[PDB]
């Protein structure tokens, strides 16, 4: 494929947030703590080879940490990158381990 890129680890970690399970109509989607820079296309393909599910579309964004914490008074942000990404209907979680 044109797997030549970084399809290796563009995706990682779920989210099990409040949005989880609440965000399931015609198509369960997802979250994934996707790497800060995985783009949409790469994400679409990430779930292709792995998870073996059919992705319709991707979205993603950023969300930023922020907090003071220090030996006295400094502390800083953290940064992330959410990613909904939709799948389909005719294919459920199937043989897998939810969590």
């Amino acid at each position: 494929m044109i797997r030549e890129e970084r399809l290796l680890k563009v995706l990682r970690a779920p989210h099990v947030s409040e949005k989880a399970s609440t965000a399931m109509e015609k198509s369960n989607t997802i979250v994934l703590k996707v790497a800060k820079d995985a783009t949409k296309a790469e994400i679409k393909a990430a779930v292709q080879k792995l998870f073996e599910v059919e992705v319709e579309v991707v979205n993603t964004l950023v969300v930023k940490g922020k907090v003071k914490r220090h030996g006295q008074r400094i502390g800083r942000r953290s940064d992330w990158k959410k990613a909904y990404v939709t799948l389909k209907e005719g294919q459920n979680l199937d043989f897998v381990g939810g969590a």
């Binding site: 290796l8 680890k9 995706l11 990682r12 970690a13 779920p14 099990v16 792995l50 381990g97 969590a99």
Partner: protein, 63 residues
Amino acid sequence: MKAKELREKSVEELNTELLNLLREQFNLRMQAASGQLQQSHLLKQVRRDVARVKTLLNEKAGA
């Protein structure tokens, strides 16, 4: 097994040595089950050898 082993394998096959083993970071590490009791953390305890391999390949450059 892993760790400094076949350090001469010119007929190398370092590929997909990462992802295939991604089970943890990729899967397991999600919630609960990345080895919770019997055998938890592996990555930095052993699967961190990814350097050794890519390092070697990087060394076996003058071939």
